[PDB]
RNA sequence: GCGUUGGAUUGUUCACCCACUAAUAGGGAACGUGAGCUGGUAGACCGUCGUGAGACAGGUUAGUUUUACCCUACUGAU
RNA sequence: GUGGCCCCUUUAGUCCCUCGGAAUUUGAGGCUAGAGGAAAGUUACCACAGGGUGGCUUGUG
RNA sequence: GCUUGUGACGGCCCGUGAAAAUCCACAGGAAGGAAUAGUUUUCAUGCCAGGUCGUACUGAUAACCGCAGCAGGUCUCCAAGGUGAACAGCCUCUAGUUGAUAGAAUAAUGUAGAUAAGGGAAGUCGGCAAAAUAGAUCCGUAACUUCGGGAUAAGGAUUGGCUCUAAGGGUCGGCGAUCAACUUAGAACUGGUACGGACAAGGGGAAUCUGACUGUCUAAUUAAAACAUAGCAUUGCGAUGGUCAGAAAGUGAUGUUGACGCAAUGUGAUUUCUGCCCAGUGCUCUGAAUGUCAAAGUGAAGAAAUUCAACCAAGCGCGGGUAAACGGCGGGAGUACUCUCUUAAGGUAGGGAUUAACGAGAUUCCCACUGUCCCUAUCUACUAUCUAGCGAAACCACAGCCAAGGGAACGGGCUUGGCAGAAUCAGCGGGGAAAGACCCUGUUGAGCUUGACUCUAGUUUGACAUUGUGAAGAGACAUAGAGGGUGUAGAAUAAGUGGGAGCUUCGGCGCCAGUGAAAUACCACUACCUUUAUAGUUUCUUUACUUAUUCAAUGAAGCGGAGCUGGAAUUCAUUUUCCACGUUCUAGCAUUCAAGGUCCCAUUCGGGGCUGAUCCGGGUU
RNA sequence: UUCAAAUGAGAACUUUGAAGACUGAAGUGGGGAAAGGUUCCACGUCAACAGCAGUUGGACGUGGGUUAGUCGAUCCUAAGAGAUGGGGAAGCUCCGUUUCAAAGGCCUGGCAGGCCACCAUCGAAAGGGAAUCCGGUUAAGAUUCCGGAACCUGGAUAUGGAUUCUUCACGGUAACGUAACUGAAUGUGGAGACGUCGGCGCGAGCCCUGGGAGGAGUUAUCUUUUCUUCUUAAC
RNA sequence: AUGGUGAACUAUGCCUGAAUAGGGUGAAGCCAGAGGAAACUCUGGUGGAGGCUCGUAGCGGUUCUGACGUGCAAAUCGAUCGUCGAAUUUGGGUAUAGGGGCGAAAGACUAAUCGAACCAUCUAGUAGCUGGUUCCUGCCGAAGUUUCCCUCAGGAUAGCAG
RNA sequence: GUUUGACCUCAAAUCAGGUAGGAGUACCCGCUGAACUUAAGCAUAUCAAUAAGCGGAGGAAAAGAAACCAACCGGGAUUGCCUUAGUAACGGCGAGUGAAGCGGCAAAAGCUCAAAUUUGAAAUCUGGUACCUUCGGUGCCCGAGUUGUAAUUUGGAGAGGG
């Protein structure tokens, strides 16, 4: 067993942490070992070239730093000297090769810096210097592109890794000290037009809904995030504030002129065409469900929408679920008088089928709902016709409508429809 | 179910030592006067074999200073003692083979056997054939001393505590081979009811936790808990890891 | 009315092969549950499955019923 | 013309009853009226107790 | 020469192969003993006595156990001659027995044996069984091999009797005299159908699968590829301990033990091979905070019972390790899918595989050999058979000739027919005798297993009590305070909201002026954030003491402190520390309140004290 | 298996004799342990039993018979069992075997001073162990009785012998010797006291064998012949 | 279930004792000779090792269309076979006791009893289903989805008769 | 006075004199404690505060003269019978379980310590011994005892002083 005890480091470590008093020769004799380990690595199935390998095989010198590696990152609060350059040579092990690094090293020394700061050895001030220049690095498109970097397991690692930082910093008080520091860092990524401020979108949306970063500061950033020239963080920045919105849109410094840059940067001001139409519908609901709950005006959306509302178009129930909620008491109804005259003249005339009749009368009464006198007298008795209609669809529609316009004016129906309360409340009320 | 081999093994019918032919039990002199302030003197008159034991022993007569008369100690030799050599035991003894010293008094580097865990044990570590224990470092106030084991730990004692000089003999006796169930028959005949070991996957479900099933396996993960209790604990009790080293 | 064989083959035979022969015909009386004599549970191993105890799509091996002296029938004998 | 064509949870009681030596105030129980709706396998290593032709066919799709 | 005892030697061991009673001797020298006489009872002789219980006989084909005067089982000593290697088999001496129901015949079928022409496995599931071989001398002996074996390999020449030759030894005599045993080799002659003349006594070979081997088990159907084994690997444990017991205990096993050990597992000689995965399930980590979070304890409300909240150990959760742990079998990247390329379970060589021995293990083939077979026949002994004597058991509704019909597919009885003569002996096995598995079901009995249900020993962590004497620190309740805000633009660091255009020390300024979602003076509201102090309130961490408590040892022996005493030692003036007058060439010895010194008495043949060997202490260490 | 005789009412089975065979010294012999318990031996004796028989019997009825200082138990301890003291347990009882006891036995000269240190008991008729052999005798008993000849233990002791006036012996270079030749406490050493196999040597008994003194047998022919006795215990 | 008795068979350990012909092979060590400068080699002998081997007693129990089958025998007889100096065979003493022991492991053995011994009591235990249920005469005299409790199911009811 | 004694605590004796054990155990006083069964299977439950097991007594034992029942115009130790009552109540509110006061009766019975100064007299008691009129008495002598033996007092009351 004497023999086999530097070779067996499960052993050696539980028998230091009794009585690290002893075991200081033992520990030495493997700090010189990592030393001299460390000094190393700072520096086909052709018929010509050489084999290649699995993959999962790997060096017996880099089997037993690893193995090192973890002994002595959790021995060295025993021993603090021989060990206060210990994490130093780790970082710059890390943010100065990159890549003359097995993936299972790197690894290694990823989980042992989180552990050293869970163990107040390293700050996270002096972490986070370490964890974020390697996803750029490995976002990098060059480094990615070897024949067995892991690039995307290290980039997911370095992710949960912050996010576990930062969940941990944010328990007994909000580390404002560090989440000031950590969203300049956000901003400062957004700048960089290619694609970087990808690790800030997917890295802000995990701290909101672990409720981590409830603050006026970050909603800016999905803000500009929004506003960005990039698909996939534009995209990132809607579907945060989608998520019905939450409850983020409460701490927006203008709502209003939001929606007026977005519809005009992203819609209709160059006419780009970059979004595909999965896309141009997200956007639509956002800009929909911000207006009908705070009470917008734009005028520009009520004819953007009627290139679009046409049944021979793509997932069109999508689109008229929003032309909905954008509706006011508060806007001209002429503007919404012709999205309702181009519904009716394209989805309940004549020939149309049932399915295409029921939908367009069900996105026109959840319209009336909000813009009452958006439809004439005229064309809602034109619409009521259908009330008995033998199809079930176009029935259930038109009920809504009648038991709609009964409660708030009952008068641009007919007698016949009038249902024994908003009639007898008409009789006294127009003497 | 069954009560199992290790359960029946506690209660001590037919696995109780096979103790008829040894020479007794091995321990050094009580601590008294002489030890503790000077030394003293003894003959060693034979070297001689313990039943049951690879170690050799060694009869060593020494006088009883509060009565006029002998007293013989059975002492476990170390290698190169011989038949009327003068063992001296004690604090202010001479750094030689098969002298008792505490160790405190000896430097560090030395090597010892039948060192006792605290003073007045009579010989706890270092017994056995071919080991010893290396003293490495003292620390006089606080009167403590570190010394290193067979099996590797690193252990702090008191310096009063003792040892004799040298390392047990019978060593290599593993080296060699048996090549036959008679000699480890003969072997355990002397030691222990330890032997033939069946196996447990050979057996019932009712005799053990391996035992049953059509194929001789066993349905779990043989590392068991520290926890666990009583017939549960069949292989691999608290295994820190597994696998060839 | 009288005859309708001898053998090879068990990595198998609900059969086929070559010979002799005058010929080498088919069937029943058991197989319309189950009935002379002979081949084709307990232990153990491999495979599939099962968390497991164990089971099986399997495969291999070893593995104790023992009349009649009674009535009838039959065969011979007073 | 007195509409239409086919059983375990919870709340409330003016001056409801009782808490059995008398009372007051909280709680509890009633009777009312309301509103809601314990538990898997295996056994060939086994054991016990019981039970178990219509004259049918033939050579010709 | 056989048996037995004994002696000196040799070999084997990770095996080194009882204890006590009892007897003796040695060292030592307390002591007592002769002189006009003692000493010695380990020299010789002489005297006295030796108790209680058992004691016959069998010890087995009749004295024991099996229900018995049961062919079974049951420990041991003595052990003649011949053949022959021989306690083998065959005959005999001594000693013992001549017991087992008898007589007459000689049918079949049987039981136990034996022989058979020619052919020789055509038999049969299958060479089952039988036959053949067999001892000793000589020649000769293959592949393969872990180099030790295989091997009596295989395959061949012989064997009697009689008469001879040669060689192989001891004791005495300055080469001979004398004595004696069975061992081999060789020759001649001679009888033969046969010569290990009966008895006794291997059949062999070419290959396959399998387990390394020797060994062990299902007593009473399974002897095996099962178990074990050496070898191999893993795990836990440094005694305040690991594993395991006990109702408890001032209790126990391993342990008369101590990592070359103990305990727990798996694999199963040697050789060769031994690549990768910790996603899962288990095991493990002296693994932060946060989350879940029992009892006690704390705070708030209430008149109180009670109610609420906070705090809240381990465990879980969370994330690190491990595959000679159960599992399991690929990796990475770009936009679950889809494209891409690496796949290091690559034979290191084209010498990569030609691979033991052992086995009542499973299997095929060949030689030899035969009545297995064509194709049966014959003989011997004991039965059967007849006789004298003795004398059961199973089974039994009643009984006993066939056919057809009905019929539960099926009558000995019923209907219709064939028939039908006493009483009987030996045989036979067709039927009746006339006494099986398999399948299903119980809301069954037990055994076993598992994150099935309810529990539980044990273990673990927390509170209280046992529980006393001290100290120093950190956090929180609770009040009193004190200040704060960079996304961008804007003079500037804009919580936010609402009132609006000066109280004025200055008119600095507030309004009117941009820029901004929001506009700043002045005064109020009520959100968050961070800090200051401790009336008190508490909680927690660390540390000191010993008398409770706990552990271990011993002969309960030398502990604690001392201008102690005496030495040095280095000091900055007086100490502080070491030592102590006690022991290290050698298989010796060390014991009689301890000799000596010194004070006293008595003069005795000797006594007592101090010291030799420091003092003190209410703690055995 | 057979023949005759005897006994008897009666004989395949009893007794004697005459024959023939068997066990064949790892026995069908002679003795023992465990177990059995009078089955041993004698005298009467046949109703039942001995799978036929029976005058016979390990049967039935009645008696006789087992002699120890030396053989054994008894004693010692082995693996182990088990009280006390103490501690558990509601308790029947459990633990443990020298433990945490004031656990008792020797001296010197209104008892004074000293010395020693230590655990009940049980546990082997094959382990250890003090001492007996021959011959004869019984219906049946014997290493036990008779005769003769010895030995061990323990005890009291007289004589002779040894020693001594150089008080507790001499000789021998030595290994050591002798008829003896004082020895308390205390201590030490030895014996008791030890495996298995191989062969070599020595001894006892047996086997084989010669001469001679005796007896028996064969002798049809031969054989100075075949068999048998000629022994010597403890001490 | 409660409380008790058993290791005289048999499993295993310990203690103390006993038993085991004749042959074959021929290991280390050793002696001489030959070839060597010497490592060393070759030859002939000696010696007597081995969990070797043939094979008695002994221990076991492979095969036989074996004998017997109310047998001598509740496991025997014969022949044949495995092993035979050791992990050997065995006597006596001793220890382990029942949900317990022991186990070279077959769920084997634990007094002809073992996938939980034996004895007595609680105990006239109990389901389910089977079997049986003892004199005469007279008079009357049936029944088979009709409706349901978690499907079988043991049932509860309609109707029938007295 | 480093002497001589008193007390306290703990021991020893084949010291003087006595005492316990074990049996029986129908009934009695306690302790401990199942399952079969019945409930649908079954954890509560029932069988049952039973059987088995342990300790301990007597001719009876135990209980017993209120820290009771009651709510009355108040009764008045305990035990047992009739009744209360298959009730109040308990319970998967299912199977099932399950008292008590009152009233009539049988038999009848009440009492004792501690806690109080005898303090003008430890007045109390065992043992040893000598006599006697011997289930005991008188005297005498060691002793127990003041860390309390006698008289007096027990809640119904009672004491002291007059």
Redesign the interface.
């Known amino acids: ?5 530097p ?2 480091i ?2 050696l470590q ?2 230091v942490k009794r ?1 690290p ?3 200081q020769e ?1 520990f030495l004799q493997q700090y010189a070992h990592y030393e001299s380990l460390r000094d190393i690595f700072m520096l086909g199935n052709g018929s010509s070239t050489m084999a290649g390998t699995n993959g999962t095989t790997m060096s017996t010198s880099t089997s037993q730093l690893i193995e090192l590696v973890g002994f002595v990152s959790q021995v060295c609060s025993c021993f603090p000297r021989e060990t206060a350059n210990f994490p130093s040579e780790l970082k710059q092990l890390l943010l100065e090769h990159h890549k003359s690094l097995p993936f299972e090293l790197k690894e290694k020394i990823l989980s042992c810096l989180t552990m050293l700061r869970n163990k107040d050895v390293i700050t996270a001030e002096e972490l986070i210097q370490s964890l974020f220049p390697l996803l750029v690095a490995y976002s990098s498109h060059g480094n990615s592109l070897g024949v067995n970097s892991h690039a995307k397991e290290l980039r997911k690692i370095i992710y949960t890794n912050l996010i576990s930082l930062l969940k941990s910093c944010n328990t007994n008080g909000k580390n404002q000290k560090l989440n000031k520091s950590t969203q300049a860092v956000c901003f400062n990524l957004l700048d960089q037009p290619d694609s970087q401020g990808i690790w800030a979108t997917k890295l802000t949306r995990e701290l909101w809904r672990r409720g981590i970063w409830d603050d006026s500061r970050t909603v800016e950033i999905m803000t500009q995030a929004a506003l960005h020239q990039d698909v996939k963080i534009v995209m990132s920045g809607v579907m945060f504030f989608l998520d019905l919105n939450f409850s983020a849109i409460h701490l927006l410094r203008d709502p209003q002129g939001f929606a007026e840059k977005l519809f005009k940067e992203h819609l209709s001001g160059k006419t780009k065409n970059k979004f595909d139409m999965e896309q141009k519908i997200s956007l639509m609901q956002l800009l929909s469900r911000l207006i009908g709950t705070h009470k917008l005006i734009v005028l520009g959306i009520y004819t953007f929408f009627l290139k679009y509302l046409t049944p021979k178009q793509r997932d069109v129930t999508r689109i008229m679920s929003a032309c909905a909620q954008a509706c006011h008491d508060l806007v001209p109804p002429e503007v919404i008088n012709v999205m309702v005259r181009k519904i009716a003249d394209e989805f309940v005339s004549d020939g149309v089928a049932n399915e295409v009749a029921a939908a367009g009368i069900n996105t026109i009464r959840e319209i009336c709902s909000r813009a009452p006198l958006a439809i004439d007298e005229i064309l809602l008795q034109d619409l009521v016709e259908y009330k008995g209609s033998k199809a079930k669809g176009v029935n259930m529609a038109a009920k809504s409508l009648i038991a709609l316009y009964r409660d708030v004016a009952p008068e641009m129906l007919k007698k016949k429809d009038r249902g024994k309360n908003a009639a007898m409340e008409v009789q006294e009320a127009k003497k | 179910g069954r009560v199992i081999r290790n359960q029946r093994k506690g209660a001590g019918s037919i696995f109780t030592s096979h103790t008829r032919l040894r020479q007794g039990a091995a321990k050094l002199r009580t601590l008294d006067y002489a030890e503790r302030h000077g030394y003293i003197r003894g003959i060693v008159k034979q070297i001689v074999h313990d039943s049951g034991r690879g170690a050799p022993l060694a009869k060593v007569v020494f006088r009883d200073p509060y009565k006029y008369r002998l007293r013989e100690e059975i002492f476990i030799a170390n290698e190169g003692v011989h038949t009327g050599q003068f063992i001296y035991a004690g604090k202010k003894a001479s750094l030689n083979v098969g002298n008792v010293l505490p160790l405190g008094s000896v430097p560090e580097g030395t090597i010892v056997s039948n060192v006792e865990e605290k003073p007045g044990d009579r010989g706890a570590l270092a017994r056995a054939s071919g080991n010893y224990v290396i003293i490495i470092g003292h620390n006089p106030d606080e009167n403590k001393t ?1 010394v ?1 084991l ?7 004692i008191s310096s009063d505590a003792r040892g004799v000089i040298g390392v047990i003999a019978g060593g290599g006796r593993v080296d060699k081979p048996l090549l036959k169930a008679g000699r480890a028959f003969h072997k355990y005949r002397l030691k222990r009811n330890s032997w033939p070991k069946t196996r447990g996957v050979a057996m019932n479900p009712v005799d053990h936790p391996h035992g049953g099933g059509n194929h001789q396996h066993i349905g779990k993960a043989s590392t068991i808990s520290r926890g666990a209790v009583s017939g549960q604990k069949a292989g691999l009790i608290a295994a ?2 597994t696998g060839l ?1």
Request: hydrophobic share 35%; proline share 4%.
């Open positions: 067993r004497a023999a086999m005890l070779t067996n499960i052993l539980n028998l009585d008093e002893s075991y033992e | 570190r290193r067979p099996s590797g730990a690193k252990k702090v820190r890891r080293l």
